[PDB]
Amino acid sequence: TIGPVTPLDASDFALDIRMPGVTPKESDTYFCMSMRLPVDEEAFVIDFKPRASMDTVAHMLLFGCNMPSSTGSYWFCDEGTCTDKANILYAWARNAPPTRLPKGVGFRVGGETGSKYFVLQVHYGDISAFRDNHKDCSGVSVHLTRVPQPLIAGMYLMMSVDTVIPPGEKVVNADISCQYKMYPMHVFAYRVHTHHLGKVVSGYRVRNGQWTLIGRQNPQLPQAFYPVEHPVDVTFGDILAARCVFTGEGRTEATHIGGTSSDEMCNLYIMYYMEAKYALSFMTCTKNVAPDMFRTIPAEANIPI
Template sequence: GITSPITPRIIYKHSLQLKTNVADLWWTTNEVEKEIIFELHINTTGWIALGISPAGGMNGADLGVGWIDQSGNIHFQDRYAFDTVIPILDNTTSDWFALQGCEQNGWTAIQFKRLFDTCDIMDVSIKSGTNNLIYAYGLIDPDTDITYHETRRGSRTLSLRSYNDPPLESKFTQLDYFDVRLNNYIIPPSDTIYVCKIYKTPSNYSSKRHVIANQFLIESINQDFIHHILLYECNSITRFDDSNLFEGVCDGSVSLIQLCSINIAIAWAVGGDYMIEYPEEAGYSIGGDLDVKYYMIQIHFNNPNQISNITDSSGIRFYISNQLRQYDIGYLTFGTDIRSTSLAIPPNVQNFIVDSYCPRNATTNIPQSGITVISAFPHAHLQGRSISTKIIRNKKVVQYLFNGDPFNFDYQLTYRLTEPIQLYFGDEFATRCVYNTMNKTHITLGGETVHNEMCLHIFAYYPRMNT
């Protein structure tokens, strides 16, 4: 949560703790005026800075730098970093504008704004999709120029224009819920292990209900071991022995697992939010006469030191609404297969591009009235740098469905789209994943370990199509 002792100047749409007891950020975007208002609080009485970076570092970063002097006056500068050196003053136009600021209880708070796109060669556009955000601070106000920040810096990858603030758990405490989770499962001492558990829809949901929010139950002592959690829908014609539902290493029952690897319903990965809420008009349907009766949770544990005797009960909590919503939510997945034969990325390459295509004949089940896409979840491993999907309609590129450039392995969020996007019968889709293997000496193949690679782009939409 937020730790700054200073009350923000206005009510903002979004807020984020950049680092506990160090830095907090608030912001509001205006898609009509094409501008964004920030308020940055940092635990220092020196200078503070916030920037947009092409690659997550100083090189090429566009920054707003400010401080409050001893008389209470605000000083604010537009700066640009040509390299990993002190950023220079922008000598073209000044496009970061201070609004208000103060110092209080050892913290500095400055409110400022800028346009999404300034058309300045020394600025970085704040585009729809993902953005690399950087921050830094010094311990004293500048006399002539800002001092080197040393280790007082940080970065985050997020979507400033479509950030989905995670709701508080307390919002749903009065609702019914059920959990899909492991039960003190002993994790094998292996570098990479996939654990699967099959669940049946609880019998008390005899009529259709809507899930309106999910909470990812990650045990804090094990959070460094968990790479991702996926919930799959099992094949609707499949029936299991309810008294002996599978739980164990996924490879231990390939035939069963294949029956439950059809549709990905819910996804979480490293750096993701622990609470996700659906829009008011839609929910994920369970129970009643629905075809899907069984689900499979898959948890990817990454244990490079092969530590023994780890037990885990992580999983997903489903909050159930008392009233049905207008639409059922479904999921689309684009990208490549995860087998080793699907990806082969050479070493020592700055930008290796993998393109995949979803043709017109694969989208003929989209109704004539269309479907509405509401969120995106891009997923790759350590070498991934960018994941994007474009809509192609009548042989022309219409727009990005979502542009996950940059992609950061440590911050794999579910992104609510700035505005919902309509898809129609016969639309086609082009997905591109870009990888950097400059730190590799051998070919990187597709696969499940973090040292292999993936190219997946998962979208939530409504109304759910018949598949």
């Protein structure tokens, strides 16, 4: 080994979270493994270094989850592994170099209310190179500290629950909105998720009837975290709003929200930071509290990228 925990700086350490020498049989194999945080006190994730085999690795995801495993182990996993409401800490996709965390920012783990386990999912797409039966140890090295950080990263997940897409309908809009009523968050990156019917997903902060884009992306592109130009402050009274556009073309019956590939999802993951003393690591919106606000949604919410 050397070990999974290594020192760095004065009072920091690194957790190498790798696959334990896997060799996948079929292509488009999803493997998971997990590791425990080696301290029980409050600590902060302040960086991620991808250690991926450009050969065969399509994507990696790191979740703050709560799935203990034996130190050798790995297993077949799918999208729902850490639920509905998965706390993604890091995504990596081939051909979408991800973005660093902003200076002073880290994810708050351990303690009485943080994650004690990290779960890593690695997608092996093209398995040409396992012709030869070598073991792959792809993954992420995570820079941890016990030194309090002034800014705390979190995730605001917007998702639709009761959308229905009729067969052959060229356009169905799944709309999501909630008023924001916390201390200020600063949005710096976003990720979108639909299945194959999704055409475009967009999210906005609306303040005083004025729409500010957070992000807009094709969900059929690599589902990584994309940066936000300038961060968007969201603040008490603001409304977060999102629209996924679906088509029914090429379907025979209606499509509902669900986990399988013949079902659909509309998820927008908004990654933010907050000042340490007011911070929440996770918020959720599953409602549409301001449906009529969508009269003024920019037209490009309905235009595929």
